[PDB]
Amino acid sequence: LVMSQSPSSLAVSAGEKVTMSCKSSQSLFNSRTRKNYLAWYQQKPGQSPKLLIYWASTRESGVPDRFTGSGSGTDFTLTISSVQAEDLAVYYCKQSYYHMYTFGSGTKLEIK
């Protein structure tokens, strides 16, 4: 199961919006539970990954709603409105539909 993310790098100004794509090589949508097993992670310089969103669009506790996730099947997207300096990080999507989880290439985000 291949996970393709993009773009590779994003350099934007504070307050602008960015959207990043994560394509799975297989539907992560389960007809039974009605859930896409796709999660989005934020990884700040040197730290461990912070779960941002799970089930494609459900935010974790305390995650600001500037972060929006969406999509189903194979095409997913993560939206970050009004980017802040604190968002400086690499964002990774992870599938948890199969026994063995898979991460994406990741998308680096820098704030000018």
Tell me the DSSP string of the chain: --EEEE-SEEEE-TT--EEEEEEESS--EETTTTEE-EEEEEE-TTS--EEEEETTTEEPTT--TTEEEEEETTEEEEEE-S--GGG-EEEEEEE-SSSS-EE---EEEEE-
Resolution (A): 2.4
Domains in the chain: boundaries: 1-112
Q: Which token pair is 102?
A: 């898979």
Q: Which token pair is 23?
A: 């394509």
CA distances from 91 to 30, 58, 63, 80, 105 (A): 24, 16, 14, 11, 9
Contact at 8 Å (CB) between 21 and 8? no
Residue with tokens 């290439």, as numbered in its chain: 105
Superfamily of 1-112 according to CATH: Immunoglobulins (2.60.40.10)
CA angle, 17 as apex, 16 and 19 as ends, to 5°? 150
CA 66 to chain centre: 13
How many other CB atoms are found less than 10 A from the CB of residue 14? 11
Residue 6 phi/psi, 5-degree rounding, is -175, 155
Q: Using omega within 30 degrees of 0 as the cis cutoff, is the peptide bond preceding 7 cis? A: yes
End-to-end CA distance of the chain, in Å? Answer: 35
